[PDB]
């Protein structure tokens, strides 16, 4: 298997719908991240949330193909990353662009304890066709980088406790049951909505290093800190990578 | 379906929700550059061969853009194979190889663009939206570098570290995204055969075949990068491609005129 | 006044010196793109409405550039309002909001440019000096993103953190700087009324008004960002603007033909 | 009021006419800055000076509007910033571009003790009309950033002791009297030249954090060091921000 | 010689090997932009003089591009001399000065491009490969900034820190690299004289001279940067240059028409 | 003579033909560099090697002039720099671009112990004419930067022991004799191939700071470490700069 480029890296993906909650969610997360900065070398990647739904509404109404919509959504994830980095600036944290993440992350994490970037990957007008909704979104981009780097982990910070058997905010929430652990292959074979991209399960099947990804509720203080120490506080997704 | 229905699902569900996915599928379909043809000029198969292969193609492009709007993407070739060999032997992952291969497609685009500049044809980034050159009879064509943008975010193959989406996939996806009318791969064989014609004594020529038929005959990985056959089956706009021999004088011109040279591969 | 006199003051005084300021005011006045019209397409008022508003405007732009050189700037709209709400609730300053709003005007420019590409009209950075597209009958128009460049250096308003110079100001200043002949704001109301026609039962239409008269009637902050009315009063080149309803078919075409649709607001 | 993004930052604006004095002014300033690097986290911003007067002479002769002249002058401030940074390179200091200052200053000041940038703000072809001379110049750009960041201070380093009642090098220098302290509103209502942009007084009126800005003579060694510790050695300008 | 022979030497020897160097010299010679003329507009000699020098040249360029494809490079002038004086007095090396001088050639390119924009002529980076503007009768010219790219990698002169390759060398090398048909330096003297005509009472005009003859007469460092005379002697494509007075109305137009105004300096 | 901008810098140029040997050469070099990181502040610059020969073969067959071939070869040196930096990423090392090397090297070496860049200089389409092979290549670019910075040294890491009187892998290798020391002027006046660019000898003649450059065999572990301490383990080239 390929070498790990940054074996000491922890990657944290912050959901765009968490950022959409504004200060009431963001201020406690910022405080928790400040306290985590001495403990971990962090690449913090933000998703897109509700503004990408609005640009999809407009773009799909204009008839635009899926490759047009992919960078339009990614913009919203970049903007969330600039908002989160500004709140952490006094601790030395800034947003860094995708080429800086892809080629210079080692030097930037030598300079400071964490940096923030957009979790969307640069698939852009070369997004894959088939669905009218861009498939390679923020969970997927964060995992591709975490696994390419051979990072020590990827933790996904959601606005729910983890993965349930149905959308726990949707029309069938009454029979939504919480899943403390699952495999990517099991999820991939089910139909129904998830709080993570379906492309994430595909990239998990070809992964070379990351064995598990935990989805935890960022609206509950201390869950992110517990997940970064390996404590089981949300849903663990086994990727089906095995130890060498 | 309705706009308001779709807008409610887009606000209220996960993008993974099958009900939102199906509503979005009912959206209108706009083709951004419908009258353009995307052509891929092979790195190993054409540009690496130098003047004897490239100069006749340059003359064909110059003649062809009088009648046909062209987006001309470059392949990579032997220098990318060398980079992949060095990097894979070090244990570097597919995302790192992907970045190295782009540089070689860029070199090829620069060399082809310098031969085309005095004919008014630019090398561009953003070919699909290079609105000005594509609207002018004096120009009517651009050159671009054919690797995809995925870089360190490249999905690896199931085995090994060679990037699975390289310049066949880059060019194909640009044609698909911009809703172009035709996609032509310019290689160094007449088209698809029942075996690698370089390695195999009595391979038979195949003028026309579907992706399912190619897979059934064990040709999933033959004259095109194999993931392109899956992208083709998922494509909204470009549902067939033509593979032609750039070494045969006038072959590209004839394909642009609608002649059935080479092999036509269809999504279904 | 003389060149040598001005040059001595420029060498020997502070730029704040009233005597240098007055000598510089006597300089010649060159208009860089005098035959161009700048148009702003509203984000909330047009682009956020989707196909029913944007497709007829795209057809009008395509028809209009046959007779009229156009620089078409985009507004921002509801997604920028959302970003401003999130960032202001965190206590972020105006300079940080300004950066967030640019991204939304860019998204809108990308969507409009993709509808216009097959008509030869590019999205550009540097519209005022996009010499080539503006010199060609095949093109004769460009799209640009309408936010100003000020970013973290944005001057805040007297109260609150919403950037006071947004896409009305960006487009206006580009028209003023390049000495364009006309500035047209494309919104979703017929023009200026005596009250917000959305909120107010018997608002009366105003075909023509001066900035001083608007301030006197309490309309300083109505259909345009209010700092634009002060920029207009200081302007060297564009001394009036026209506000028109982009939802009414042909309104933009008629304004470009010299018809007095909408409201004309004059510096004096 | 908005949060302070970088409350520990000190901003120092070096006048372009100080840099125009060449080595005789620059070498002592460089030595003083070297000694200040361990004491402060510094963003050092350079103004434009006499070469911008020459480009204004040419540009105004060609009839060019004020938005054309604004980036032409800014170039001269960038070039002074590269000259000053080269003299400090052996201490870890480099010039950084405007987008790096606007989005990544936190990480760059985590890496090293000071960086240098152009004090002009990026108003460029969107400079405000009215005067044929660009109004938002180096004093103004430096203050906008210092106040946006909520910095601990902005100190302006001039080639004179501070603000006088008349230009102390001009035709009325005989009655020029030194002002140890003034308010921006008082200055704004006077006519006559100043050693600071008139736009600076406008941006002071809408400021949210910086309460005072000191103008001091960079040709006298030790004044910059004293001003950065709050010692009154030039003219204090009160912005009319008040404590929360 | 043969391709295969050259390819073996290229694989098996150092690039310093005389046998590989000689084989490479036998390669074909492609001219990228053979029908273009590169013109340098002097910074000190023209642009620093303002409207009286620049406006007639702008009119000449506009008229001339009807018949002649032009790449117009800018010099630097007095502001670069000021930067060099400040930086040299601090002890900064040639590589640091080189970077400072570029900024001044850029300012000059911006000012000239703003006067030319409404005539359809752009300022570009990459003039030699600005395929689109150079292929259109509406445009047929571009402006570029004349300093070379060497920046901190500038070779110093034998003495002192002033960069020896400045805008004469930048423009000359672009003409040489793109295989342009003609190189014209636009200065503020009629051409080369036997002494500096500004400083010297009875200098005699020289209509035509070779680089060897200039060196023999002590003119190696007179009207052109002196390293340009050595680059000219090594050049593959541009083997002579013409120096003309841009202050004399129509001089640039006449030189483009083949009239022998000014001085022709030949490699041999 | 000009000041030294970065007097504490060590520059190391790694030959493209060393990188072409793949893991068998690169892994031991990487291990040796890892151990050198605490000892030196390093700018590591990679040359181009055999892929630039292939692009010259194609480009010369297409008739392209020397300015076309210069950036085509430089690309291959950039790619070797990205490969070497990836192997060192876990130690904080990244590739940095030419403008970052030219203007911001001081801050990047304050952040981390070494960075990697392309040794080719940006002569590009303004490469000098005369030869059909670009003359200002990786040895030359590395020396221009080392001498412009006034660095403490430049060490060139070759796939041979140093400079011999004939190519020691070529048709006359039988009479190739090893040169432990030579002057640039002596080399410049000889004909025949060298393992260093002939342009390097020209830039040595105008140098202001670097007195000697050692060429050593990177295929022998420990030679690079010895050369960086001044130990004579390959060929010393005297530039003919003298002490002030
Ligand atoms: N099976 C499921 N289990 C848990 N949540 C689900 C499931 N199906 C759908 N959801 C929904 O997904 C929501 C999370 O939305 P989503 O994943 O789009 O946000 P995000 O991850 O914050 O956004 P982005 O992908 O832009 O970062 C949950 O609040 C829940 O309503
Ligand atoms: N069944 C087959 N039919 C035809 N050609 C085949 C077949 N199987 C393998 N090939 C090979 O595929 C080659 C074309 O693919 P190759 O990757 O060389 O092309 P390319 O587009 O030039 O590559 P690049 O641009 O990536 O260098 C032909 O040279 C041929 O040897
Ligand atoms: N007196 C008035 N007359 C007319 N319209 C008014 C008046 N006062 C307020 N308005 C409102 O101004 C709106 C146009 O401004 P708005 O900011 O929505 O435009 P926009 O240019 O589309 O914005 P953006 O591009 O910033 O989204 C109209 O929709 C109308 O509701
Ligand atoms: N009232 C005043 N008090 C003090 N100096 C004044 C006043 N009026 C004008 N001046 C002049 O301003 C000069 C300083 O010039 P200026 O402010 O343009 O330089 P700078 O700040 O170095 O330049 P830049 O703004 O480009 O950084 C002083 O030397 C003095 O001659
Ligand atoms: N023998 C000579 N014959 C003619 N002119 C000479 C001679 N020797 C020196 N010169 C001077 O060369 C000058 C032109 O070179 P200069 O460097 O001023 O030109 P430029 O191209 O405008 O410079 P830049 O663009 O670098 O500012 C003329 O103004 C003239 O004074
Ligand atoms: N006089 C000589 N002494 C030593 N080596 C020589 C000499 N002449 C030629 N060579 C050859 O030069 C080879 C080194 O090749 P070269 O200098 O091109 O590689 P590199 O420096 O790794 O490449 P790059 O310049 O792209 O970094 C040696 O292996 C040897 O065969
Ligand atoms: Mg989610
Ligand atoms: Mg590409
Ligand atoms: Mg804009
Ligand atoms: Mg001042
Ligand atoms: Mg240049
Ligand atoms: Mg070598
Ligand atoms: Mo950075
Ligand atoms: Mo940086
Ligand atoms: Mo960096």
Q: DSSP for B2-35, please give it.
A: -HHHHHHHHHHS-TT-HHHHHHHHTS----SSTT
Instruction: Report the C-alpha gap between D12 and D44 in whole angstroms.
Output: 5
Distance from the E220 Cα atom to the nearest Cα atom in chain F, whole angstroms? 19
Helices and strands (H, E) in chain D, number of each type: 9, 9
* Whether the Cβ atoms of residue D199 and residue D136 lie closer than 8 Å to each other: yes
How many of the other CB atoms lie within 10 Å of CB of C1? 11
Contact between chains at D110 and A92 (C-beta distance less than 8 A): yes
Cα B8 to ligand 3 centroid, rounded to whole Å: 25
Distances (CA, A) of E36 to E60, E141, F188: 16, 9, 38
**Exposure of E113 by Cβ count < 10 A (0-12 exposed, 13-18 middle, 19+ buried)?**
buried
Mutate to test the pocket of ligand 1, among A26, A190, A195, A236 (most ligand atoms within 8 A of CB): A195
Whether chain B has a CB inside 8 Å of the CB on C66: the answer is no
Burial E186-215 (b: 16+ CB within 10 A, else e): bbbbbbbbeeebeeeeeeeebeebbbeebe
Strand partners, C241: C265
Q: Which residues surround ligand 11, an ion (CB under 5 A)?
A: E 145, 147
Whether chain B has a CB inside 8 Å of the CB on A168: the answer is no
CA neighbours within 13 Å on the CB side: how many for B41?
A: 31
Picking from C95, C107, C151 by the largest number of A CB atoms within 10 A of its own CB, the best residue to mutate is C107
* Whether the Cβ atoms of residue A78 and residue C103 lie closer than 8 Å to each other: yes
Q: Report DSSP letters for E103-120, one per residue.
A: HHHHHHHHHHHHHHGGGT
How many of the other CB atoms lie within 10 Å of CB of A1? 12
* Whether the Cβ atoms of residue F134 and residue F73 lie closer than 8 Å to each other: yes
For residue B167, what are its two tokens?
A: 């310049």
Distances (CA, A) of A76 to A19, A137, A138, A177: 11, 11, 11, 31
Identify the DSSP state of A93.
-
Residue numbers after which chain E is interrupted (C to N above 2.5 A) read: none
Distances (CA, A) of B142 to A29, A123, B47, B100, E69: 48, 22, 17, 23, 21
Nearest alpha carbon to residue B199 among B183, B233, B222: B222
Picking from B49, B88, B114 by the largest number of F CB atoms within 10 A of its own CB, the best residue to mutate is B114
Q: Residue D63: which of C10, C28, C95 has the nearest Cβ?
A: C28
Helices and strands (H, E) in chain E, number of each type: 10, 9
Tell me which H or E stretch contains E228.
helix E226-234
C14 dihedral zone (left: phi>0; alpha: psi -120 to 50; beta): beta
Q: Which residues surround ligand 7, an ion (CB under 5 A)?
A: A 15, 195
**Nearest ligand for residue B17 CA:** 1
* Whether the Cβ atoms of residue B156 and residue B100 lie closer than 8 Å to each other: no
For residue D147, what are its two tokens?
A: 């106040």
Instruction: Report the C-alpha gap between B87 and A203 in whole angstroms.
Output: 22
Picking from F18, F66, F79 by the largest number of B CB atoms within 10 A of its own CB, the best residue to mutate is F79
Specified resolution (Å)? 1.6
Give the three-state DSSP class for E263: strand
Strand partners, E206: E192
Instruction: Report the C-alpha gap between F27 and F83 in whole angstroms.
Output: 11
How many of the other CB atoms lie within 10 Å of CB of C222? 19
Whether chain A has a CB inside 8 Å of the CB on C111: the answer is yes
**Exposure of C204 by Cβ count < 10 A (0-12 exposed, 13-18 middle, 19+ buried)?**
exposed
Q: Which residues surround ligand 12, an ion (CB under 5 A)?
A: F 15, 195
Instruction: Report the C-alpha gap between A215 and A237 in whole angstroms.
Output: 8
* Cβ of F234 less than 6 Å from ligand 6: no
Give the three-state DSSP class for B132: helix
φ, ψ of residue B144 in degrees (nearest 5): -140, 160
Q: Report DSSP letters for chain C, one per residue.
A: --HHHHHHHHHHS-TT-HHHHHHHHTS----SSTTEEEEEE-TTTTGGGTHHHHHHHHHHHHHHTTT-EEEEEE---HHHHHHHHHHHHTT--HHHHHHHHHHHHHHHHHHHHHHHGGGTPPB-SSGGG-HHHHH-TTT-EEEEE-S-S-GGGPPPPSSSSS-SS-HHHHHHHHHHHTT-SEEEEEESSSSEESS-TTT-TT--EESEEEHHHHHHTT-TTSSS-HHHHHHHHH-SS--EEEEEETTSTTHHHHHHTT---SEEEE--
Nearest alpha carbon to residue B185 among B138, B255, B135: B255
Distances (CA, A) of E195 to A168, D244, E168, E186: 90, 72, 20, 19
SS3 string of B187-214? ECCCCEECCCCCCCCCCCEECEEEHHHH
For residue D61, what are its two tokens?
A: 């002769």
Within 8 A by CB and 6+ apart from C2, the residues are none
Contact between chains at F2 and E179 (C-beta distance less than 8 A): no
Tell me which H or E stretch contains B185.
strand B182-187
How many of the other CB atoms lie within 10 Å of CB of C267? 17
φ, ψ of residue F156 in degrees (nearest 5): -105, 125
Whether chain A has a CB inside 8 Å of the CB on B62: the answer is no
* Cβ of C166 less than 6 Å from ligand 3: yes
Contact between chains at E50 and D58 (C-beta distance less than 8 A): yes
- The CATH number of whichever domain residue A107 belongs to comes to 3.40.1160.10
Q: Residue F79: which of B103, B111, B115 has the nearest Cβ?
A: B103
CA dihedral C126, C130, C134, C140 (to 10 degrees): -50
On whether the C1-268 domain is CATH 2.30.29.30, my answer is no
Instruction: Report the C-alpha gap between D89 and F107 in whole angstroms.
Output: 8
Q: Which residue of A has its CA nearest to F111?
A: A111
Q: Residue C103: which of A57, A64, A75 has the nearest Cβ?
A: A75
Give the three-state DSSP class for E244: strand
For residue A238, what are its two tokens?
A: 């086994």
SS3 string of chain F? CCCCCCCCEEEEEECHHHHCCCHHHHHHHHHHHHHHCCCCEEEEEECCCHHHHHHHHHHHHCCCCHHHHHHHHHHHHHHHHHHHHHHHHHHCCCECCHHHHHHHHHHHHHHCCEEEEECCCCCHHHCCCCCCCCCCCHHHHHHHHHHHHCCCEEEEEECCCCEECCCCCCCCHHHCCEECEEEHHHHHHCCCCCCCCHHHHHHHHCCCCCCEEEEEECCCCCHHHHHHCCCCCCEEEECCCCCC
Instruction: Report the C-alpha gap between C14 and D139 in whole angstroms.
Output: 13
Q: Residue A62: which of C51, C92, C99 has the nearest Cβ?
A: C51
Nearest alpha carbon to residue D100 among C89, B126, A104, A77: A104
* Cβ of D210 less than 6 Å from ligand 4: no
* Whether the Cβ atoms of residue E166 and residue E225 lie closer than 8 Å to each other: yes
Nearest alpha carbon to residue F101 among F50, F151, F52, F38: F151
Instruction: Report the C-alpha gap between F13 and F151 in whole angstroms.
Output: 13
For residue F60, what are its two tokens?
A: 């010369």
Q: Which residue of F has its CA nearest to B90?
A: F23
Domain count, chain F: 1
Specify the residue for token string 């409610």.
B8
* Whether the Cβ atoms of residue A151 and residue A7 lie closer than 8 Å to each other: yes
Identify the DSSP state of D129.
S
Q: Which atom of ligand 1 is nearest to the CA of A137?
A: 25
* Whether the Cβ atoms of residue C30 and residue C19 lie closer than 8 Å to each other: no
Within 8 A by CB and 6+ apart from B259, the residues are none
Contact between chains at C50 and B134 (C-beta distance less than 8 A): no
Tell me which H or E stretch contains A44.
strand A41-46
Distance from the F68 Cα atom to the nearest Cα atom in chain E, whole angstroms? 8
Q: Is the dihedral of CA E99, E103, E104, E106 positive or negative?
A: positive
Nearest alpha carbon to residue E148 among B226, B112, A26, F67: F67
Instruction: Report the C-alpha gap between C61 and C67 in whole angstroms.
Output: 10
Whether chain B has a CB inside 8 Å of the CB on F57: the answer is yes
F165 dihedral zone (left: phi>0; alpha: psi -120 to 50; beta): alpha
**Exposure of C174 by Cβ count < 10 A (0-12 exposed, 13-18 middle, 19+ buried)?**
buried
Contact between chains at E50 and D82 (C-beta distance less than 8 A): no
Nearest alpha carbon to residue E152 among E89, E100, E78: E100
* Whether the Cβ atoms of residue F33 and residue F113 lie closer than 8 Å to each other: no
Instruction: Report the C-alpha gap between B226 and B244 in whole angstroms.
Output: 17
Instruction: Report the C-alpha gap between B133 and B234 in whole angstroms.
Output: 30
* Whether the Cβ atoms of residue F5 and residue F148 lie closer than 8 Å to each other: yes
Task: Please state at what angle helix C78-89 crosses helix A50-61, rounded to 10 degrees.
Answer: 170
Domain that holds residue A78: 1-244
Whether chain F has a CB inside 8 Å of the CB on A111: the answer is yes
Identify the DSSP state of D3.
P
For residue B227, what are its two tokens?
A: 């993931």
Pairing between β-strand A153-158 and β-strand A212-217 as defined by DSSP bridges: parallel
Burial B47-79 (b: 16+ CB within 10 A, else e): bbbbbebbbbbbebbbebbeebbbbbbbbbbbb
Task: Please state at what angle helix E18-25 crosses helix E3-12, rounded to 10 degrees.
Answer: 150
Mutate to test the pocket of ligand 5, among E147, E197, E228, E241 (most ligand atoms within 8 A of CB): E197
Distances (CA, A) of B210 to B189, B255, B262, F161: 19, 19, 14, 59
Nearest alpha carbon to residue D175 among D186, D164, D159: D164
Q: Is the dihedral of CA F194, F195, F196, F201 positive or negative?
A: negative
**Nearest ligand for residue E101 CA:** 5
Say which experimental method was used. Answer: X-ray
Whether chain A has a CB inside 8 Å of the CB on D128: the answer is no
Residue numbers after which chain F is interrupted (C to N above 2.5 A) read: none
């Amino acid at each position: 298997r390929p070498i790990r480029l940054l074996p000491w890296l922890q990657v944290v993906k912050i959901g765009g719908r968490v950022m959409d909650r504004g200060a009431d969610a963001i201020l406690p997360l910022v405080e928790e991240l400040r306290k985590l900065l001495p403990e971990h070398r962090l690449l913090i990647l933000t998703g897109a949330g509700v503004r990408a739904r609005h640009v999809f509404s407009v773009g799909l109404d204009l008839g635009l193909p899926v490759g047009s919509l992919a960078p339009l959504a990614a913009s919203e994830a970049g903007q969330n990353g600039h908002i989160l980095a500004a709140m952490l600036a006094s601790e030395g944290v800034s947003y860094v662009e995708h080429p800086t993440v892809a080629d210079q992350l080692a030097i930037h994490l030598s300079a400071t304890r964490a940096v923030v970037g957009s979790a969307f990957p640069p698939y852009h007008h070369h997004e894959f066709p088939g669905s009218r909704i861009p498939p390679h979104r923020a969970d997927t981009g964060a995992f591709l980088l975490a696994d390419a780097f051979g990072a020590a982990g990827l933790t996904i910070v959601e606005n729910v406790d983890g993965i349930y058997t149905a959308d726990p905010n949707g029309p069938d929430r009454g029979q939504a049951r919480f899943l403390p652990e699952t495999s990517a292959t099991d999820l991939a074979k089910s139909e129904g909505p998830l709080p993570v991209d379906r492309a994430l399960l595909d990239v998990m099947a070809t992964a070379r290093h990351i064995e598990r990804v935990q989805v935890v509720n960022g609206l509950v203080p201390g869950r992110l800190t517990a997940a970064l120490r390996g404590e089981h506080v949300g849903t663990l997704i086994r990727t089906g990578v095995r130890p060498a | 379906n309705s706009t308001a229905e779709l807008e409610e699902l887009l606000m209220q569900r996960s993008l993974t929700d099958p009900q939102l996915q199906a509503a979005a599928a009912a959206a209108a379909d706009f083709r951004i550059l419908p009258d353009a043809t995307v052509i891929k000029i092979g790195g190993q198969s054409v540009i690496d061969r130098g003047r004897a292969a490239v100069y006749p193609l340059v003359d064909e492009i110059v003649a062809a853009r009088k009648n046909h709007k062209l987006l001309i993407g470059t392949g990579a070739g032997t220098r990318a194979r060398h980079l992949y060999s060095i990097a894979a032997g070090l244990g570097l992952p597919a995302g790192v190889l992907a970045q190295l291969g782009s540089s070689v497609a860029d070199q090829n685009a620069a060399m082809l663009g310098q031969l085309l500049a005095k004919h008014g044809i630019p090398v561009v980034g953003g070919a699909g939206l290079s609105a000005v050159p594509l609207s002018l009879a004096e120009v009517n064509a651009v050159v671009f570098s054919g690797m995809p943008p995925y870089k360190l975010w490249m999905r690896p193959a199931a085995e090994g570290v060679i990037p699975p989406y390289r310049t066949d996939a880059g060019c194909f996806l640009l044609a698909e995204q911009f809703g172009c009318k035709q996609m032509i791969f310019v290689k160094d064989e007449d088209g698809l055969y029942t075996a690698n014609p370089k390695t195999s004594k009595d391979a038979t020529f195949i003028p026309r075949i579907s992706v399912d038929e190619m897979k059934a005959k064990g040709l999933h990985d033959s004259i095109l990068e194999f993931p392109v056959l899956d992208l083709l089956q998922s494509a909204q706009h470009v549902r067939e491609v033509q593979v032609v021999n750039g070494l045969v004088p006038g072959n590209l011109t004839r394909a642009l005129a609608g002649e059935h040279v080479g092999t036509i591969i269809t999504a279904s």
